[PDB]
């Protein structure tokens, strides 16, 4: 589980740009205010490498 990918982001990346900010993403109309839950997901998902 050491390898993760950014599933959620507000906008696309530029060429050769790196994003390591672990801020919450607002996937719905309701604000998240830094707390995950309904319509609030962490942007980073871990690969199930087996």
């Amino acid at each position: 589980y050491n390898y993760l990918y950014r599933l959620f982001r507000k906008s696309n990346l530029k060429p050769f740009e790196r994003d390591i900010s672990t801020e919450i993403y607002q996937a719905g109309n309701k604000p998240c205010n830094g707390v995950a839950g309904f319509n609030c997901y962490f942007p980073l998902r871990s690969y199930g490498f087996r």
Binding site: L7, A27, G28, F38
Partner: protein, 50 residues
């Protein structure tokens, strides 16, 4: 669960925002597609297993 009900969905436009608007759904987990990009994609072979 051994006789799970399968329904084919075709020839319509599906608004997935109303699924989030009224939602007693505790678990909402999507594997191969983003939950917020469902309204921006076109699909077929849509099957609901209840």
């Amino acid at each position: 669960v051994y006789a799970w009900n399968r329904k084919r969905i075709s020839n319509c436009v599906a608004d997935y925002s109303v699924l989030y608007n009224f939602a007693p759904f505790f678990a909402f987990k999507c594997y191969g597609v983003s939950p917020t990009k469902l309204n921006d994609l076109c699909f077929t072979n849509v099957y609901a297993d209840s």
